[PDB]
Design a protein around this ligand. Structure first.
Ligand SMILES: CCCCCC(=O)OC[C@H](CCP(=O)([O-])OCC[N+](C)(C)C)OC(=O)CCCCC
Ligand SMILES: [Zn+2]
Ligand SMILES: [Zn+2]
Ligand SMILES: [Zn+2]
Length: 245
């Protein structure tokens, strides 16, 4: 997903997903301790820095190849042989964030959590769970799709307090893998002969530009809503794990 601006949801789908997940936690009045939401907002600057940094600097963006932002649940690999993938990388920052938290280094803890949330967010994007990059055919489709998502995401906000609490085990890797499994299933709903064909013809015909956008919207809405619920459960897990007990 996009992450063009560090603090603006308008062009940062990653930030939007996290903010909506926090809203889910805020709406939940039977399980979530609201002081957890207070802490996230207190260290929002560091959190947002982490969400953003993943796409703009080393080692997070792997020398501009973003290899660590991809993870195919079927073979457990990213799109470049032997490179690090989203599951191990996302889990790495989830744990680093927790250790910092336990040591009262809030700035470090929330920056790392932000990074971890970025990776979790990415595997919810079908293309990232299928190793379909901006260089995959049709070239350029990956980025144009994520840019389009920013224009319609607000129509798919989750408005209840039901996050996927304890969705998977206590191991963050299970959460990232689980999200990728579901996302890859919805891959064909976004990338297929039709959308590929229309995207290419969209170059000369606005008529076709509207066609592929419409075609991928339903599945996009579903993916965005799932991403919100999973992220809320992931954050809740982080606090249950490192928040004393
Ligand atoms: C020269 C143009 C750069 C565009 C690159 C791009 O759109 O990357 C998207 C994801 C990046 C992970 P993401 O979080 O979904 O990033 C989206 C936003 N952004 C690329 C602007 C940082 O990575 C790839 O597809 C790898 C191949 C790169 C080809 C040059
Ligand atoms: Zn992304
Ligand atoms: Zn992407
Ligand atoms: Zn990314």
């Amino acid at each position: 997903w996009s992450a063009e601006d560090k603090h603006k949801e308008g062009v940062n789908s990653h930030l939007w997903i996290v903010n909506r997940a926090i809203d889910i936690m805020s709406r939940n009045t039977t399980l979530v301790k609201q002081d957890r939401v207070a802490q996230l907002n207190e260290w929002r600057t560091e959190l947002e820095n982490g969400i953003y940094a993943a796409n703009y600097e080393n080692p997070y963006y792997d020398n501009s190849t973003f290899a660590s932002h991809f993870y195919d649940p079927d073979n457990g690999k990213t799109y470049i042989p032997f490179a690090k993938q989203a599951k191990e990388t996302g889990a790495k920052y989830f744990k680093l964030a927790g250790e910092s938290y336990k040591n009262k280094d809030m700035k470090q803890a929330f920056f790392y959590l932000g990074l971890s949330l970025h990776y979790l967010g990415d595997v919810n994007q079908p293309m990232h769970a299928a190793n379909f990059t901006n260089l995959s055919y049709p070239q350029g489709f990956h980025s144009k799709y994520e840019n389009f998502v920013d224009t319609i995401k607000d129509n798919y906000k989750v408005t209840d307090g039901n996050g996927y609490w304890n969705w998977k085990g206590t191991n963050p890797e299970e959460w990232i893998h689980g999200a990728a499994v579901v996302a890859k299933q919805d891959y064909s709903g976004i990338v297929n002969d039709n959308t590929k064909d229309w995207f290419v013809k969209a170059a000369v015909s606005q008529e076709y530009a509207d066609k592929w956008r419409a075609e991928v919207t339903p599945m996009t809405g579903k993916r965005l809503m799932d991403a919100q619920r999973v992220t809320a459960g992931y954050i809740q897990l982080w606090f249950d794990t490192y928040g004393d007990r």
